[model samples]
Target chain A: GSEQKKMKYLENLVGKTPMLELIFDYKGEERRIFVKNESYNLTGSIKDRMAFYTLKKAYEKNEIKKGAPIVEATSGNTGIAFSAMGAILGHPVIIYMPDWMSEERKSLIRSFGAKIILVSRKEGGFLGSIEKTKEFAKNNPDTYLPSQFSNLYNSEAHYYGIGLEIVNEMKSLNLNIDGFVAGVGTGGTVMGIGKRIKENFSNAKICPLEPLNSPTLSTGYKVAKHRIEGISDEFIPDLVKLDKLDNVVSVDDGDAIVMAQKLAKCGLGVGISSGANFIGALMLQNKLGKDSVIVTVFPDDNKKYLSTDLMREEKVKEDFLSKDITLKEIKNVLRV
Target chain B: KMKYLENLVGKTPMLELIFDYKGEERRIFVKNESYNLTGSIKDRMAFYTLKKAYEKNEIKKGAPIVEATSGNTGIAFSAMGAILGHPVIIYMPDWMSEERKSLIRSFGAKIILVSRKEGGFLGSIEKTKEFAKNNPDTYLPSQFSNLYNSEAHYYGIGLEIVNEMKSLNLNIDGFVAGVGTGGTVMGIGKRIKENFSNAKICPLEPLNSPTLSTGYKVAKHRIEGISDEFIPDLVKLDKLDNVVSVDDGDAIVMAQKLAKCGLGVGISSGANFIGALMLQNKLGKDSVIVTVFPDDNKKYLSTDLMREEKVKEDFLSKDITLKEIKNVLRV
Candidate 1:
């Protein structure tokens, strides 16, 4: 109840999130495709939800000023959100992206008008970017990381906002959810969705998808050569509540990227990380039966992928469509 | 069964294109066929194709539906398949998008991916036939050869247009269609010609793959659906007053400009509009021309099409920030 109320008592976080009620046949077994469309916010990604919740709570506690400057280190998306928040709240923002990021991201970052400090990375590259960021946070009392990693606000955000929103949405539903699924970025979303789903559908499973390369939850291993631009990094983010999380299922990059394109071609156009989340949803064997419900999150729009090289060419599967329609083929399709 | 048939789909809306500076000198009408349930004008043809086939018992009860397509027909067939309670299987190239394949499957249709190396349209058709041979409880809405493909628009899109004109107190001077299956114009043209003999039926083809307007009696081009090497039997070539062919350059050119005009429609859609623009240019600026907007921008976005259309200034945005030029593929 203490943690529940902590999440329930957050800032102006309402509406904008959407639900996509869809059907998909996993392998040949029919699967329910429920995606929480998080692209409804003004910012390009779901980090906007976390950024606002964190900022608003800090303000409510008088931990920060109403129009004070805020700064954070990010890959790109969160910085973009802060820039938007700055413009709306009449506060200035500064974001540091790894100097190793693509030029396209830098261009977009500045286009948002937020100041950027492209610091030199240590030999380990992104890890160096993070080490340097924590150094800055340690030195600068004036700055806030929102401490997305290992932050109570991070886990609390989903508990109050997304978690409660999903609960409120089900007020009229005739049936109960069997489980919840989402990619663990700052670990807030998974914890958030998990806590809310458990509160209502206590029997339902709560699933978290992680990049196989950089799973922070599994085996207590948090760092890796994570190629996925969004979600699952080394840091125990400030907002992440350690207790609420269930488990993490690591998804591969190639499969994740393919699912992103699949969603787009199907007219959903959800971002890349969401594809990994979908794959995670299919992995759960507990809900394979008829009418077993599974809910997943589609974090952002994939237009950003177009700015990357992967979008330049077609990603064709090598074997093509199998001619033999046997039980084995059905099983293989499921494996993908 | 036909009682609620009218409630099914494609009571298309019509909007006039502002074609000239002479106040009322020239006029153009966009059928706004996108108003249909599934978007685009093809749903009209698709709805009628399946409905008529069902009426004639061509699609026997308890039969699954199958069709070969790039995307749109698969989407439509899947939409109707779910409604009709018939399982649908789409034969398509596996290379497009996972979302498209899954979307078809999402619509409760099974997608049999065909190898692009094996056959073009033939690949899909061949596999579809094989699949059907083994699975006899299947019906294929073969748009290429099906008479209902053309007939659907004849009574559906055309007669509706004529009746619409009568109700609105406006005279449609001409009709234009992007010739792919040729059913859209062939079927609709015959009906319009019957009511308004002076109304010209102009069929436009992409120059890369011009079927109707190619001048050559028999030639093949790789432009899908529209400019095939052979003409489908359903085409009422005699019903058309003229044919216009637009080149690839012009098709892409107009398509880029169309998006700037706030219509984010892609190439195939551009081909139809360019055909309409051609009719407007030749038939006098005041000519009232109507054409089909086939396909959409979503698929084209995958390729550098949107970036290709982007103005040069987009590239000049700060000369690739000081960040490493080669950003790590994975952040």
Candidate 2:
């Protein structure tokens, strides 16, 4: 009962993030894009919603006992989320992450008083990390493994959190979603938010984004390495149902870096995946017309990406869409 | 005119932090200022000061804005200045965290690093004054002497806390904050005193530094933003209650403990928390003490916040145990 109460208290830190309206010009026409600013979450990322929700659901279902150890495999933000939520919930958190991930991620997880087991490429990278989690859970009884890649509750977290919030904000604004785009990592955001948006606005197009350099979703497997660290990891995640979603949108990793830099100049300071999502929203907007309402999510802040390509000067591609788009203004939309 | 920035400025979450002291329950209300734009309480002062300056026509449109800061203020001005279409130039000490410099530069703001030989923090401020003098068009927000700094906290942070406590049927017994520019403590203290009339307004400083208690800079401390070369002019010691002191090592330990409890606050926040408990010890444990977690832990990764802090026997954090946290107010 105390654990449940603690979970409820920790839930307060995860949600109710701000929604923003980014106004920009596209070829001399005024267009607006609605973004769910997820940097305000407990761990400064959208993964907080999923990690907290999944743990809560596990508790509710009596799947784990009090102070159950939480073990997960992640590239960056998800590990920080589980570490923070787990520590606050009084659980021993152990994160299995690639050794090559950003230094900030490892530092942040350790700062939350969690033990990090760094997996190397020789042992296994992201996939090896997941296997290690499986082995750790098997060796240690009563260990909770939040397998984000296949966890249906991962998407369910977004379905109830970001998805519901977006719908409510749109209702208050008297606006309709012509398209919604999100860079798929666990496929939770796209699948979960897509389902909710389509249920309310049946005409809305839900698109999943991947790095054009990688094209994991487009090729049905990991093709090439991309600088976008969070999305298109080595394989297509199990949660993504490609047939149920609309056409896939792809943005070059370099282009996403360029776009994220532009966003920082406008005072947004978002991550690389956020850049891909913004460009994905624009690509969808181009098809639906400038008047069509589009929505996306800025998954995390840029603080974690200082060591990544986000802080470096990215080479502009000749065909980059971000080069043509000029950011004009941003307005905050209050959620009802 | 700056509706977007205004919407993101104030209205931060107020947390009711519950902890244990001598096997007894103690509660302290903490304002989560990290939720403000650019992840610091400096946003309130920056936005308010710039807005007032624009209203009075003290700054021209597209004029270069110059200021010196250790970290958070530079970031706040960088974001706000870029959004408002002003070219911002920050003169910060080279000793500050790398994250601070990176964040300011991320917003397309120019940063001039002032080394220790060039006067470090004090030199940074002097450089801003000299630059403003030479350029003649640069708008200098002299935060230390600027009354608007305290005024912003008085009207924004202090007013919000008072209103929230009143809504919850609570009274302020003590208000504690670590003096950076002294804006937070002075402004919020003035407002809390006006509202409660009997509450104690305490300003906290590093025990290792003892700048405020000694009336001058005695020693350097690791708590980044506060306790500079001298006592800031904005901090009126007579108007405030007893000055609270927290050791830098003890503050780091407290910050780590808070992160374990899911707060993710900075080292200065740890100092303010200890200061609040110290005041609570003096005023009785049941007294409703309030404080502010000035910024988040993101900027402190390169600092000592991420290191293993040695716990001294006399440290207040050694005895205290954090219990629970509740979001008392969302707005």
- lDDT: which candidate is best? 2
Task: Write one digit per residue (lDDT tens) for candidate 1, span B1-331.
Answer: 4333333345444434343222333445555443333444666677787777778888876588888876667777776665555678888766554435644654456788776477655677777888789987779888878878778888777777787666657666788877666778888888888888888888777665655655455343322336543566667677677887766455554555444332334466656766776677677765667675554443454433344333332221112111111100100
Candidate 2: pairs in clash: none
> Which docking class does model 2 fall in?
medium
Worst 10 residues of 1 chain B by lDDT: B322-331
| Model 2: CA > 4 A from native | A1-9, B22-24, B326-328
At residue B207, give the lDDT of candidate 1: 63
**Least well predicted 10-residue stretch by lDDT in candidate 2 chain B:** B1-10
Cα distance off (Å), candidate 1, residue B277: 1.9
lDDT by residue for model 2 over A1-336, one digit each (tens)?
776676666666767777889888877788889998888777788998999899999999998787889998875788878887887677889888788876776788888878889888899777788899999888998999998999999999999988999999888889988999999899999999999999999999999999999898989989888887689987888999999999999999988998899888988888999998899999999999888999999998888777677878777878899988888878655643
CA-based DockQ, model 2: 0.56
CAPRI grade of model 1: incorrect
